[PDB]
Design a protein around this ligand. Structure first.
Ligand code: NA
Length: 181
């Protein structure tokens, strides 16, 4: 419909930890916005099954966070593998954005990309090599006019779709608060 090589692909992952070589993806969510950040479509929100041996690598922060959110129960009950999650996500993205055109968009999105390179390279390849990291703007704003940041707050639930919605909201806030274009 609104298919455009200017559209942006937003992605957030939840993982069993911070190390792509040791840990696994347990949730993924995608959103497509147009170039002006209007949300066009939300993609699959997928809890990815992992065995107990992989959930058992989670430290206290990860265990308590993902248990309290309900994600661990969803992971245990899920019948979706990484490969199937890639397939669902690509089938969604191909309807909205051409391959290789959108930077990867989110907060500290380089971390998600590391997990995509390791565990979902077919999906990593769908992105342009660049990064749209909303936290770049967060960090520059903290240094250049930190009182701006008290006008915006996040819930931070570590439910992947809600968190990527907050990433988009953060950039929308910066568009009005710190940009003049
Ligand atoms: Na994240």
């Amino acid at each position: 419909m609104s298919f455009s090589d200017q559209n942006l692909i937003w992605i957030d992952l939840e993982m069993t930890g911070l190390d792509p070589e040791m840990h696994k993806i347990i949730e993924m969510a995608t959103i497509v916005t147009d170039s002006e950040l209007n949300i066009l479509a939300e993609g699959p929100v997928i809890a990815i099954h992992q065995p107990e041996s992989e959930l058992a690598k989670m430290d206290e922060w990860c265990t308590t966070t993902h248990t309290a959110s309900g994600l661990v129960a969803r992971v245990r009950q899920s019948q979706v593998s990484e490969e199937e999650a890639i397939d669902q996500t690509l089938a969604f993205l191909k309807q909205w954005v051409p391959e290789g055109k959108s930077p990867i968009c989110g907060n500290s999105i380089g971390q998600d990309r590391r997990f995509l390179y390791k565990h979902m390279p077919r999906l990593e390849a769908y992105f342009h090599y660049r990064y749209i990291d909303v936290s770049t703007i967060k960090e520059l704003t903290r240094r250049w006019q930190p009182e701006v940041l008290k006008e915006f707050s996040k819930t931070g639930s570590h439910l992947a779709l809600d968190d990527i919605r907050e990433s988009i909201a953060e950039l929308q806030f910066y568009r009005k608060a710190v940009f003049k274009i």
